Design a binder for this molecule. Structure first.
Ligand SMILES: Nc1nonc1C(=O)NCC1CCCCC1
Ligand SMILES: Nc1nonc1C(=O)NCC1CCCCC1
Lengths: 237, 237
């Protein structure tokens, strides 16, 4: 119902087939719940070799994205989007993406994602063309395409019809009942939905505490969560 | 020279064309510096509909990856890799990936990346088949393929011949000298390499301090870095 439009600026638009042609996101595109539209800076060049990079002022080992083709591609995308479109640049210098951030971005009906290549883009373009800068993680990649697709996949899950709480997920079990000597926890076989809910919640609480203690600090646990966590920490001791 | 082999278990192997056919990583594959080999659990099914999912014990809204096809695919990949291969599962419950973690993973000559779909995989498979669990970020995606590709792209940068310090990157500038009233910092035009190096370092220090203060805590700054940062904080005031 509340479909989403995402414009993409990229030198390798065919990379985005990975999300538009496969799985849940592929279905979302086919069903017109999500639309991904790509513009290639190479198409906006004029020199006879279609040059899309340029030398950095001050010297340096690498190259930067050439301003004019990239600038023109962005302007074209903005015009196609109309008013309301938020322009986002993916880079390690951006705001750290988390699920809260995903929910925020997902409120936007229109996004334009600029995918950097080489050593990046001109700083003045960030000032004049980019509304927000985001990062998917503290690591370095060869291009902004994978971060853009990661963002798209993340926000797509919030679009109505695409699918079917601060804690890590509980463990999951399926057939067979015994796998290499390891049995399914009896509570999951019991058929008692309330016990199953509490066990799963307790497991999530235990796993978050053991693996990601800092995530617990940012939460105000319910009475039930405080109790189950206490139980888990007592059993762990 | 120190090429890398990465095995992938995925229901959508064609997604990985995004990294194997394009850009820096595409070149790495063509030049045999990086090899990405995929196995599809669907190929290991036997039922007439090639079923790759299964119902979770204890009930629940979603489905899990079916154990037998996934187990068989993993075993096949391991056999193809031989000894030394580290098997990695991508999920939000994994160890948080950062650049330090990328450098660690990049030491491995062989990796096998298991890409979960649906609600995930059986916990006992994690215990019996998975060596390490990693996460690219605190957000939820539809599948492990994008995280796997993100990891591959990240570690590929450390392979010799693929390409050409705790701080955020400095701003970059290219042509033209004036862009919508915004000029290139004169120091980058000066031709004085030492001044340019110090300005870039100071900019990185300033940006890290303003955007990601916590990253500074984890660093032991050099005498020069302490001074340039002090200068930046004085100028900011
Ligand atoms: N990490 C990240 N989070 O979002 N993007 C990231 C990245 O590593 N992007 C690669 C590009 C970014 C532009 C400069 C060239 C490298
Ligand atoms: N975040 C992440 N970091 O690594 N993987 C992530 C993820 O969100 N993976 C999606 C899959 C994970 C298996 C269960 C179904 C969802």
């Amino acid at each position: 119902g509340s479909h989403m439009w995402i414009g993409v600026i990229s030198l390798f638009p065919e990379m985005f087939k990975a999300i538009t042609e496969f799985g849940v996101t592929g279905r979302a595109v086919k069903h017109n719940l999500l639309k991904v539209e790509c513009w290639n800076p190479r198409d906006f060049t004029f020199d006879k070799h279609k040059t899309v990079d340029d030398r950095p002022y001050g010297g340096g080992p690498g190259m930067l994205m050439m301003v004019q083709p990239l600038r023109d591609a962005i302007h074209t995308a903005k015009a196609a989007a109309g008013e309301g479109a938020k322009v986002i640049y993916l880079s390690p210098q951006g705001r750290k993406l988390d699920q809260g951030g995903v929910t925020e971005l997902a409120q936007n009906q229109k996004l334009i994602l600029v995918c950097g290549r080489y050593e990046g883009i001109d700083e003045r373009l960030i000032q004049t063309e980019i509304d927000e800068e985001w990062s998917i993680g503290d690591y370095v990649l060869t291009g902004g395409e994978l971060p853009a697709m990661t963002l798209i996949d993340a926000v797509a899950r919030f679009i109505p019809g695409v699918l079917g709480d601060g804690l890590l997920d509980c463990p999951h079990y399926t057939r067979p009942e015994v796998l290499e000597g390891l049995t399914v926890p009896p509570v999951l076989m019991s058929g008692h939905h309330e016990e199953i809910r509490k066990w799963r919640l307790k497991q999530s609480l235990q796993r978050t505490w053991l693996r990601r203690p800092e995530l617990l600090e940012g939460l105000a646990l319910t009475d039930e969560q405080r109790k189950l966590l206490k139980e888990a920490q007592a059993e762990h001791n």
